[PDB]
Structure formats: structure tokens, C-alpha cells
Design a protein around this ligand. Structure first.
Ligand code: CO
Length: 281
């Protein structure tokens, strides 16, 4: 029934939904992302009983696009990013202009726009109010500007196989750069230049990174949380990682979810696609 998993991922229609992370000041981050990054505010949810507020931002509606799910915990001003979390990436057809705009609005450019060290893709880096890094990548034809979540991992081949077997992702691109002592793999559900990828980074001889308390998880839509969580459970037995929240409906809001950690301890939430669409209304 391991071949049943292979078959399940074929029939399922999985989608990267949002990255969930915590911010010290909700209005400050909304302002930064709308003014500096050109994002839209898509949805907001205050949950006073649990002392938190969500805001969802991105470049198009949540039913078609990947988003950021900001989490503001009442009173909590500051979080620790840790060494594992890499960056989010924003594709834009004119990165020089974008970086200049960011600076004009009072944002922080940490790496000026220009071709990569040996290459000709124009990139830049910005840093947000809480310290999260945003790669800006110049790309002419982008249907999804919110285009990467980069996370650091201890064993690239283990991770690739985990995301393949647990989550049905495709290895889209793999790039070893022995010169600079790193390897990257782009994983996802559609061509890299049309989708949000998970970019996993291995640094030669580094097996351990801290998870911090700032980045929370990535959420992935699925047509069946039970079948997807079975694929996960099978994958975790072979590769490491663990189910945390068993599949089933959330109380009150009713959305069916499961959650788990991968072999490096990065958290993923599976979300029933239809329940998710219903949350948008
Ligand atoms: Co990147």
C-alpha cells in the first residue's frame, strides 16, 4: 500500500497555500508589505478568545495565489528567527526600481540590485521589520510573484525524498555550487517560474539549524487530509519527521487539517482545499 501513496499524489490536486509566521506589530508589517513590496491585504481575522490576529497578504486572491499568513499575538513584540529560516522571495519585472522604491518608503535593502555572483539574474534582498529576509528576483513573466519559501536543511537528498514521498512535490531544479559550498533544490507542484517553490538549502558539512520561534509553518491544500496524512505517516517511518496534529476537523471553524514536522523539524499543515475555500467566505 506504498504504491497507493504514489497513486494518491497523482490524483490529488495539492497547492502551496500560505507561509505562517509571527510578527511583533501587525500594522507595521501590513504597511511594509503593501507600500514597500506592493502586496495586497487579502483577509484579516481577529480571534480575541485566543489573543491573536491574522492578516493574509499576497499578490492575488487566496483561491489562486500563495499568501503570507501573519500572526500577531496580543502584547508580544518580538520573536527569534533562528538560523534555519532562509527567506521569502518576490519576483518582479524590474528589481532596480523595486529596490529603489523600498528604500524611498523607508524599507531596508541589505543587498543592492544586480546580477548574482557569476551569473546574470538580477536579485536584491530586503529585510522586513521583524528581520525576515525577502529575496527580490527579476523575472519578466510571473503568474505568482510570491515565489519561494527558502529553508535550510541537514541532508538535501533525504529532504527531497521526504517532500516527494510525503507531499508529492516534484524536484524541479537542483543546483550544486561547490565553489560557494552549497547545494539548492527547488520543490513544488508546477513549473518553477509559474509557482511558489520550496527552496531547500544545504551548506556543506552543516547538519543542524535552530527553528527559532518566528516562522511557524507552511500550509498545503489537499483534496483529502486523511489520505495525505497517511502518505506523510508512511514517509516519516522511512525518512524521519512526525505527525503532530492527526487529521480531522478544527472545532468551531470546522476546517479539516493535519500537521507534521519534516526530518529537520520544519512544520507543515495539510488543509482540505474545499474547507479552505469556504474560510474565504
Ligand atoms: Co531564494
Amino acid at each position: 500500500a506504498a504504491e497507493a501513496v504514489v497513486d494518491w499524489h497523482k490524483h490529488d490536486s495539492k497547492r502551496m497555500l500560505h507561509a505562517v509566521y509571527r510578527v511583533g506589530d501587525l500594522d507595521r508589517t501590513i504597511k511594509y508589505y503593501t507600500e514597500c513590496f506592493g502586496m495586497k491585504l487579502l483577509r484579516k481575522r481577529d480571534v480575541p478568545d485566543e489573543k491573536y490576529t491574522n492578516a493574509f497578504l499576497g499578490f492575488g486572491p487566496e483561491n489562486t495565489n500563495f499568501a503570507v499568513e501573519l500572526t500577531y499575538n496580543y502584547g508580544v513584540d518580538k520573536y527569534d528567527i533562528g538560523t534555519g529560516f532562509g527567506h521569502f522571495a518576490i519576483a518582479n519585472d524590474d528589481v532596480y526600481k523595486l529596490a529603489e522604491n523600498i528604500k524611498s518608503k523607508g524599507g531596508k535593502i541589505t543587498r543592492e540590485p544586480g546580477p548574482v555572483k557569476g551569473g546574470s539574474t538580477v536579485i536584491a534582498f530586503a529585510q522586513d521589520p521583524d528581520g525576515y529576509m525577502f529575496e527580490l528576483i527579476q523575472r519578466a513573466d510571473t503568474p505568482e510573484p510570491l515565489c519561494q519559501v527558502m529553508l535550510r536543511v541537514g541532508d538535501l537528498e533525504r529532504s527531497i525524498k521526504f517532500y516527494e514521498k510525503a507531499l508529492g512535490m516534484k524536484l524541479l531544479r537542483k543546483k550544486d555550487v561547490p565553489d560557494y559550498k552549497y547545494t539548492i533544490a527547488m520543490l513544488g507542484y508546477a513549473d518553477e517560474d509559474k509557482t511558489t517553490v520550496l527552496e531547500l538549502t544545504y551548506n556543506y558539512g552543516v547538519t543542524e539549524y535552530s527553528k527559532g520561534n518566528a516562522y511557524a509553518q507552511v500550509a498545503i491544500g489537499t483534496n483529502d487530509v486523511y489520505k495525505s496524512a497517511e502518505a506523510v505517516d508512511l514517509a516519516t517511518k522511512e525518512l524521519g519527521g512526525k505527525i503532530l496534529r492527526q487529521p480531522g476537523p478544527l472545532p468551531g471553524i470546522n476546517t479539516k487539517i493535519a500537521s507534521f514536522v519534516d526530518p529537520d523539524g520544519w512544520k507543515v499543515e495539510l488543509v482540505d482545499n474545499t474547507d479552505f475555500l469556504k474560510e474565504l467566505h
